[PDB]
Ligand binder design. Structure first.
Ligand SMILES: Nc1ncnc2c1ncn2[C@@H]1O[C@H](COP(=O)(O)OP(=O)(O)OP(=O)(O)O)[C@@H](O)[C@H]1O
Lengths: 268, 244, 244, 268, 244, 268
C-alpha cells in the first residue's frame, strides 16, 4: 500500500464514490487540541439570569483553568427568541434567522468575556489556530460564540424557519473537530428527565442514555437540539457529552474533574 | 411558507472540474456569460475541482479532520471565482466574498449585472462529522444559497451531458445510460459516484422554493443559455416541491 | 459653516419599538418604503427597541459599565437593520456596516436608491461616562450622521403620533399633551420621558445644517410619505440653525 | 431592593424617565481591569521629536511593565494638525476630521509598536478584543491609538470644525470604562502653569487643582481638552488623572508608583 | 502580451504635494474632476506629499528600516484619498481600500462613475531593501496597477509643468530646461532629481500594455481634461510597449 | 554634509534627489527582532510530500522552539502551479497570479498551524499584529504565509506572467526588515549543485557561494528565486541565507545552531 493509493482515486473518482469514501474513512486521525474541554454556558439557562447564576460559574472557570484547558461557548437565550418571533412572522427563511441569533451569542460572549478579562482570557477572533490563550499555563482558556457560521447557508429544518443548528451544535462541533477530551453542556436543569422537567408526570432522572434509546423514548429533543444527537452518533472524537446544572455550584468543576454528576449522553 | 428574497435572481454554478480544463473550456464560457449578462440577473458560483483533491490528499496524509479540510477546499472555489470574475471584469463583474454574498448582494447586483462567488458554504470548522470528505461542497452550497433567496432557479454546469447510471468516464463508462430526468429521492437511494453531492439531495428535501435544478454540460456552448430559458438540454432533477 | 457632503440625501430612522411589533407593524412600513424608493435617496437607520433593554438589564446586573453596554445595544439596532434590509432586498436594498456608511455611502446610493444601517454611533467603549445608560443611542446617532453628511432632513419614525409632554404609553395618560411643534431648547428644559435620546438634544445644539427634525408615527400609513415632503403630520423640532 | 425592580420598568418606561435611570445607577460596579494603568504618549510632545524623546520612555516602559500592567496610548501630532488645516479650510465637518486624525495616532502607534516588539508588546488588533498581552507577567502591556472611534459621528463643538474629542479623551475614556486604577498623561511639561506655557511670562506652577477651579482660573482648555474635564466631572472609576513630564527621565516611573510629581486634576 | 482586464479605464494620479496647498489648489481640481466624470471611467489614486516626509524623519530618526516606513507613507496617500473622495462625494464618488480596488473595482465603477484610492502599493513590510526611502512610492503603485488592469492611459497630475533637465525649484534654476517629451530608457540613465520615482522608470521597462504616460501641471486648469483626450500639455514618456 | 540636517532636506527636496537619498543612507539602524530566525517550509519541497517529510520537521520545530525564536513561513507548492498553468493560459497578468498563489501559502500555513496548535504556536491574524507569540518563551514561534502581499501591484518579470516575487522572497524580506539574525530555507535538497539535483550524475554540491559567483556560474535560478539574491545584494540586515535539506532530520536544528550544513549564499 506504500507510496500513496489515493493519488489515484482522489484524482480519478467523484467524492460521492463509495470506493473513495471508505479509503478516506480509513486515514490517520489527528487531534488538534486533545487535552482541552469545551463548555456551553446556556443563554437562557445561565447568562440571561445574570449575576446570580453567572458569577458563581465565573469563579469556577478561573479555578479550573489551572489544571484544565477550557473552551467556553455562549448561548443565545431570550433575545434570540424575540428575533425569531419577529422574523418568523415576517416569513424570512432560516438562513436569515441564523445570523440574527448569532449576534445574541456574540453579545453573551462579550458580556461573559469582560468578566474574565482581568484573568487574561479573551474573546476569540481570527482564532482556532490561535492556541496562545489556551497554551499559556496562566490562561489556558478562551471565550467564543456558540452559534455556527452558516448564516445564509444554514441547513433548514423539515418544517419551520427556526435554525436547526444552534449554540449546542456550534459548541459541540468545535469540540468534535478539535479532538477535545470532553464536551460539557452547562444548563439550568439537572440533566435529562423522562418527561418535561418543569411539568412532568413520573419524571425519572436519566443519569445515562445513548442516542438510539433517546430516539426511542420520544426524547429526541428534550435538553439538547435534536440534530446534536445525530451529530453525536457521527462524531469521531467526542462520542459522548454531559449535561450539568450550573445553577448548582460546583457541578461545573466536578464534571471537569471527570465525575459523572448530571446526565451523560453516549453515541453508541 | 417563507418569502422569496430575490425572486428575480438566476443562480448558476460552474463546476470546479470545468475550470481545470483551462482557456479552452473557460473562454467559450466567458463569451457565453457576456451574452447572458443583459438577459438575466445572475449570481455565478464556482466549485473547487481537482486542486481541492490535492489539498485533501495532502491534508488527509497529515490526518487533519474533515472540518480542517472544508475551509481549504472552499479556498479553491474562491480561486476559481477570482479567475472567472477577472475574465469578465471589463463587463462590470467582480468576485465577492461570503459576507457580501450574504449581506450586500442585492445592492451589488443592483449596481452591476452579475457577480461571482464561491459555491462552498462558510461551514468552516463546523462542518459535519462522519465523513472524512466534507459533506457540503459547491453543489450543496449553491443550492442552499439559491433556495434561501427564493431565486427563480439553480443551474449546474459540468463537463458531462448530465447524470448517468454511473461515472460515464469511470470503469463502467460503456455501461452508463443517461437519465434525462430524475428525482432527488430516486438519486438519494441509488448508489455510485455522482457529479453532485449526496448533500445536495439532502438539502433539496427541505427546499421551500426551488422545484428543479438542471445539470448541463458547459463544454457544449448554448446549453447554459438554453437551460436558463427552460429548454431541456440536460438532466432535470426534481426537488419534490410544488408550485404554489 | 461646513459644506453639505450629500445634499440630496434623506435620512429616515425607524424606531426599535416599531420593529418589535412584528409583521403587523412592519409589512405596512416596508410596503410604504417600497413606494418612496424612486422618489428619494434614502438612508434608513434602525433603532434597537426592546431587545436592547434586555441586554442592559443583564449587562447592568453583571456590573458592566456604560461603555460595555453601548456596543451590545448597537448590535440590536444592527439586527433590526438586517431584518428590514431583507424584506426590501428584492428592491435592491442591503444593510451596510458603519465603516461603509462613513466612507463608501455615495457609491452605494449611486448603485441603489436606498440603504440600511444602524442608527447607533460607533462610540462603543468610548461612550461617555456619568450615565449607566449610554448617552448616544440611535436617535442621536441618526442626527449626528444626518448633520455630518449635510442631508436635506432627518425623519424619525416611531410608534406614537409624536412627542407628548407626558409619556403616552408610560405614566399618566390623563395629562399627556401632544406637542404639534417644539424646540430643542424648550425640550432640553423639559424633564420627563421622551421618544428621543436626551443626547439627540445635545447634538441638535451644535447642529450646523439641519434646521428641523420631525417625529412621526410609523403605524399610520402615509405619514412617513408625507413627512418626507415636509407636510406637518407629526411633532416638529427646531434645532436652532438657519438656512431658513 | 431585590435586583428585580428595574426589569419591569426597563420593559415599561422611557429610559429618559428618572425612575428608570436611578435604580440602574445603583447596581454592582464591576471593574474589568482595575489593576491596569493607562498612559498617553504625546504625539506633539513626545513622538514628533523621535529618538531623543522616545528611547528614554521606551527604556522606562520596560522597567515598569514588570511591576505594572500598562495600556500605552498615543497622540496624533503635527501631521494631524496638517490634515486639520487642509480639511477645515475646505469646509469639511468635524466628523470627517475625526477619521483623518485617527490615521496619525495609528501611525505613531505602529512606530512605537516596532520599538517594543523585541520586548513582546503588541499593537491592538481586532479593535482590542485581546486581553492576552496584559495578563502575562512576561508582557503586561499593550500599545493602542488614543483616538476614540466616533469618526463621522464625532460630536462637534459650538464653533469651528476641529474635533472636540481627541487622543487625550480617547485614552482617558478607555481608563474610565476599564476600571483602571490610574490614568497618566505623559507630556513635555512638568504639569500645569497659569499662562500659555510657550509665552513663558514666569507663571505659577499649580501642583494640584480640581476641574471647577480650572474653570475659575480661566485655564479652561489648558493642556487637557476642554471635554476631558467634563468627562472627568462625570467619570466614575477614574476621578482624577495625572500630568507628568516625559522629557525629564524618571517622571513616568515615579508617577507609575503613585508619586505626586507633576500636576493632578480631580473631579471633585 | 496578457489581456487587458479593464481596457476602458483611465487611471489618474494626484500628487500629495498638490493636496498640501489647501482649498486654493483643491477646489479648482475638484470642480475640474466634476466635469470629467461623465466623460471618462476614472480611477483616482492620490500620492502622499509632505506629511509622508514627517513620518520619514521621525521613523528614520528612530532607525526604522525601509519596510517600516512604507506603510506609514501609504497612509498619507490614503488620507489624501479620503479628502478628495469627500469633496467629490456628492457626485457619487467615494474612497475605496486596496482590497476592494484589487477585487471589486469593476462593480463599483459600474455603480458609480469614479472612485478614489491610494496610489501607494500594499508592499508594506515586503518593500525592497537597499535604500532607506521606500523604492515603490505613489507613482510606482499607480502605474503598476494601471498596467495590470490594461487602462487606456495613465496621466500624472503634479504641481509642476513637467520634467526639466534639473529641478527648477532647488538651488540650480540655471541649468533646468523643460523636456516636452522623453523616453523611459533615457531617464534611467540620466541621473538627478525627478518628480517621479526612479522605480517608476523600472516598472515601465517591463510594461506590457501602456505605451506612454503624460505628466501635467494640475495647478493650471484645463490641463488634465486635455491630457485625458491625448492632447500634449506636458512631459510625455515612452515605456517601450509594442505589438511584438 | 551630515545626517542630522534631514528634516529640512525632506521638506524642500524631492525624494529621488541623491543628497537626500545619500543623507538618508546613514541613519540609525534598528533591529526589531534581532533574536528571531525566519525559516521556509517548501510547499513543493516539503509540505506537498505529506506526513513523511512534515511530521519530523514539526518535532524539530518544537524541539528547537525553546532555544530559538522562530517565524515560520510556508510555500505554495503544486496547487499554485495549476492555478498558474490555468491562469497563464487565460492571459492573466502576474498581478492576478500573485493573489492566486497567496491562497496556497495560506492553505499550507493553516495545515501546519493545526499540527502545531497543541504546542501553543498560532497562525497570525495579519503579520504585524503579533510579536506576542514570539514574546512568550513557551511559544516562541508563529506560522504565516510565505507569499508577499503585492497582490495586483506585483512587479512583473522580464518575460512571462509568472510572478517574480514568491514565497522565497516573502520569507526573506520579512527577515531583512525585522532584523532577524538568520534566514533558513528548508527544502528537499541538500543545497546547491552546479546542475539540477534530480538529474545529475555529475554535479558537485557547492558548500558556500556568494551571489556574484552564482550569476557568473550560470546558476541564476537553481535553488532560490532569481530576484531574492538581488534582494540579498541590497539587504542591510540579512547579508546571507542558508538552504538545507528537510528530508534529512537534524539539518534544521544544526543550521539553527549556526552550522555550515547545506549551501550558504552570501551577498558580498
Ligand atoms: N453519475 C455520474 N454522472 C456523470 N458524471 C459522473 C458521475 N459520477 C462521476 N462522474 C464524473 O465526475 C465528474 C463530475 O464530478 P465532480 O463532482 O468530481 O466534479 P465537479 O462537480 O466539477 O467538482 P466541484 O464540485 O468542486 O465543482 C463528471 O465529469 C464525470 O466525469
Amino acid at each position: 500500500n506504500s507510496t500513496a493509493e489515493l493519488e489515484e482515486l482522489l484524482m480519478q473518482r467523484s467524492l460521492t464514490d463509495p470506493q473513495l469514501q471508505a479509503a478516506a474513512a480509513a486515514a490517520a486521525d489527528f487531534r488538534i487540541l486533545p487535552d482541552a474541554t469545551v463548555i456551553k454556558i446556556g443563554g437562557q439557562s445561565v447568562i440571561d439570569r445574570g449575576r446570580a447564576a453567572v458569577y458563581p460559574l465565573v469563579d469556577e472557570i478561573v479555578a479550573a483553568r489551572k489544571n484544565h484547558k477550557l473552551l467556553i461557548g455562549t448561548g443565545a437565550g431570550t433575545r434570540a427568541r424575540h428575533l425569531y418571533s419577529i422574523a418568523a412572522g415576517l416569513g424570512l427563511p432560516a438562513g436569515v434567522l441564523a445570523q440574527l441569533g448569532s449576534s445574541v451569542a456574540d453579545q453573551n460572549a462579550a458580556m461573559l468575556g469582560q468578566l474574565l478579562a482581568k484573568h487574561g482570557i479573551p474573546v476569540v477572533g481570527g482564532a482556532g489556530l490561535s492556541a496562545v490563550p489556551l497554551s499559556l499555563a496562566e490562561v489556558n482558556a478562551v471565550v467564543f460564540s456558540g452559534m455556527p457560521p452558516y448564516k445564509l447557508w444554514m441547513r433548514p429544518a423539515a418544517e419551520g424557519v427556526i435554525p436547526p443548528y444552534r449554540t449546542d451544535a456550534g459548541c459541540f462541533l468545535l469540540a468534535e473537530q478539535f479532538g477535545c477530551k470532553q464536551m460539557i453542556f452547562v444548563k439550568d436543569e439537572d440533566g435529562l428527565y423522562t418527561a418535561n422537567p418543569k411539568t412532568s408526570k413520573d419524571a425519572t432522572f436519566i443519569p445515562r442514555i445513548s442516542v438510539d434509546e433517546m430516539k426511542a423514548k420520544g426524547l429526541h429533543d428534550s435538553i439538547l437540539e435534536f440534530p446534536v444527537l445525530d451529530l453525536l452518533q457521527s462524531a469521531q472524537h467526542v462520542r459522548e457529552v454531559q449535561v450539568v446544572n450550573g445553577l448548582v455550584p460546583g457541578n461545573l468543576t466536578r464534571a471537569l474533574a471527570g465525575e459523572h454528576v448530571g446526565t451523560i449522553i453516549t453515541a453508541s | 411558507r417563507p418569502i422569496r428574497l430575490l425572486p428575480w435572481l438566476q443562480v448558476v454554478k460552474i463546476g470546479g472540474r470545468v475550470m481545470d480544463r483551462g482557456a479552452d473550456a473557460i473562454l467559450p464560457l466567458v463569451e457565453e456569460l457576456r451574452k447572458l449578462l443583459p438577459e438575466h440577473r445572475l449570481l455565478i458560483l464556482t466549485g473547487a475541482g481537482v486542486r481541492a483533491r490535492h489539498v485533501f490528499s495532502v491534508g488527509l496524509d497529515l490526518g487533519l479532520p474533515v472540518g480542517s479540510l472544508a475551509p481549504l477546499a472552499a479556498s479553491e472555489a474562491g480561486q476559481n471565482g477570482h479567475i472567472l470574475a477577472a475574465m469578465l471584469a471589463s463587463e462590470g463583474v467582480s468576485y465577492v466574498e461570503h459576507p457580501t454574498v450574504a449581506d450586500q448582494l442585492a445592492i451589488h447586483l443592483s449596481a452591476t449585472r452579475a457577480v461571482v462567488g464561491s459555491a462552498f458554504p462558510p461551514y468552516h470548522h463546523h462542518e459535519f462529522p462522519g465523513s472524512r470528505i466534507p459533506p457540503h461542497r459547491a453543489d450543496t452550497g449553491a443550492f442552499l444559497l439559491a433556495d434561501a433567496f427564493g431565486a427563480a432557479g439553480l443551474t449546474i454546469v459540468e463537463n458531462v451531458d448530465g447524470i448517468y447510471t454511473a461515472d460515464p468516464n469511470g470503469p463502467d463508462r460503456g455501461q452508463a445510460r443517461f437519465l434525462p430526468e430524475t428525482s432527488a429521492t430516486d438519486l438519494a437511494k441509488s448508489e455510485g459516484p455522482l457529479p453532485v453531492d449526496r448533500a445536495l439531495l439532502d438539502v433539496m428535501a427541505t427546499a421551500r422554493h426551488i422545484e428543479r435544478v438542471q445539470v448541463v454540460n458547459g463544454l457544449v456552448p448554448g446549453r447554459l443559455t438554453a437551460a436558463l430559458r427552460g429548454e431541456h438540454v440536460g438532466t432535470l432533477i426534481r426537488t419534490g416541491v410544488r408550485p404554489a
